């Protein structure tokens, strides 16, 4: 897998070439295109590329190898990068909205000297680049319109999710009462699971000619569920994670996030435990956050997670058995294996 991830990053350079070149018939806009190039190179590079890579892996497993000519695979590479650009667009914008300082250990684009709120237009350009690529590489393909609509629906759903999330954790408002499990699962589904798990596989499906509404509804049932586990596990690792094997240290408590952990804690917790979480959930002081962390362990949450994970794992297998056909189960199982590890 981590060999294919090399050929994927490899293609970025062509993606950039093809995008930063309508200045050919239009030298007028050269300065703008140069900024676009810089936006792409700062923001589309430096993550794990797993979503876009999933398009390519899925594509191979879905389409005949004798159908996999140089051009087909080229479009697979481009659509996966389209997923990554959709992500880069969300992240640049999300970083501004919640005033983050760093992303991928690195300085947030909007925080760089001389960028600031201009990053809002930068973010929008990242979104537009998706549709320029699709038209450049897929205009003639029969699934063309399908992919445009899929990308657009994924944008809209993520944005609804971001809204839900922003209503839910108004930065400057610690109201633990709106952190229900039902609102949690609703936020994970729209803001994270649709574009992170359904979109990549759906894209490869359409590219492989599988446009059937039932097949997508079935692939969606599996992927949304995998997405829900993914975020739940991420909320768990944020805190109890091993900061060495993860990649950074977590701050969900220090940000009043509607984390899975805190939904669980509140779902339990005597009314004294209620009002001591309602006391430390937000501040930057390591004494106050480690207090809640403690209250979590005291409620055995890490245990109820480890139970949840095993239950979640058997549920997803039951889902693959039931709803994978006639797609090769490998397409879902390859994913499950990498998320649940």
- Which residues contribute to the annotated binding site for Mg(2+)? 94, 98
Determine which residue in the list 13, 145, 175, 275 makes contact with its own copies, applying CB under 8 A.
145
Give the active site residue among 89, 179, 197, 332. 89
Binding string, residues 31-50; x marks residues near ligand BFH by CB under 6 A: -----------------x-x
Determine which residue in the list 9, 18, 73, 160 makes contact with its own copies, applying CB under 8 A.
160
In angstroms, give the least distance from the CB of 177 to ligand BFH: 30
User: Does 48 participate in catalysis according to the annotation?
Assistant: yes
User: Does 332 participate in catalysis according to the annotation?
Assistant: no
Does position 231 bind ligand BFH by CB under 6 A? Answer: no
- Give CA separation, 214 vs 208, 210, 315, 317, 327, in Å: 15, 10, 20, 19, 12
Residue closer to its own copies, measured from CB, 18 or 160 = 160
Known binding residues for isopentenyl diphosphate are 48, 51, 87, 104
In angstroms, give the least distance from the CB of 23 to ligand BFH: 27
Binding string, residues 10-39; x marks residues near its own copies by CB under 8 A: ------------------xx-xxx-xx---
Determine which residue in the list 54, 154, 157, 280 makes contact with ligand BFH, applying CB under 6 A.
54
Give the active site residue among 22, 98, 175, 311. 98
In angstroms, give the least distance from the CB of 223 to its own copies: 18
In angstroms, give the least distance from the CB of 282 to ligand BFH: 26
Binding site for its own copies (CB under 8 A): 28-29, 31-33, 35-36, 93, 96-97, 99, 114, 117-118, 120-125, 128, 131-132, 135, 145, 148-149, 152, 155-156, 159-164, 166-168, 170, 182, 186, 189-190
């Amino acid at each position: 897998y981590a060999q294919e991830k090399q050929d994927f990053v490899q293609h970025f350079s062509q993606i950039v070439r093809v995008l930063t070149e309508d200045e050919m018939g239009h030298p007028e806009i050269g300065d703008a295109i140069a900024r676009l190039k810089e936006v792409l190179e700062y923001n589309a590079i430096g993550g794990k590329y797993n979503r876009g890579l999933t398009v390519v892996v899925a594509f191979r497993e879905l389409v005949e190898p004798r159908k996999q000519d140089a051009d087909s695979l080229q479009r697979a590479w481009t659509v996966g990068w389209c997923v990554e650009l959709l992500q880069a667009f969300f992240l640049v914008a999300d970083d501004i909205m919640d005033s983050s300082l760093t992303r991928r250990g690195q300085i947030c684009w909007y925080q760089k000297p001389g960028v600031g709120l201009d990053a809002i237009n930068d973010a929008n350009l990242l979104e537009a680049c998706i549709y320029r690529l699709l038209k450049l590489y897929c205009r003639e393909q029969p699934y063309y319109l399908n992919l445009i609509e899929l990308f657009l629906q994924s944008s809209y759903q993520t944005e609804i999710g971001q809204t839900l999330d922003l209503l839910t954790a108004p930065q400057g408002n610690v109201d633990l009462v709106r952190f229900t499990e039902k609102r949690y699962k609703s936020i994970v589904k729209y803001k994270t699971a649709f574009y992170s798990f359904y979109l990549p596989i759906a894209a490869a499906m359409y590219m492989a000619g599988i446009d059937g509404e039932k097949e997508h509804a079935n692939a969606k049932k599996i992927l949304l569920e995998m997405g829900e586990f993914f975020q739940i596990q991420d909320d768990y690792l944020d805190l109890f994670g091993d900061p060495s094997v993860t990649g950074k240290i977590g701050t969900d408590i220090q940000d009043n996030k509607c984390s899975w952990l805190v939904v669980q804690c509140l779902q339990r917790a005597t009314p004294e435990q209620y009002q001591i979480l309602k006391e430390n959930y937000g501040q930057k002081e390591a004494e106050k956050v480690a207090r809640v962390k403690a209250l979590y362990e005291e409620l055995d949450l890490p245990a109820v997670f480890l139970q949840y994970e095993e239950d979640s794992y058997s549920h997803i297998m039951a889902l693959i058995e039931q709803y994978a056909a006639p797609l090769p189960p490998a397409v879902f199982l390859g994913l499950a294996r990498k998320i649940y590890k």
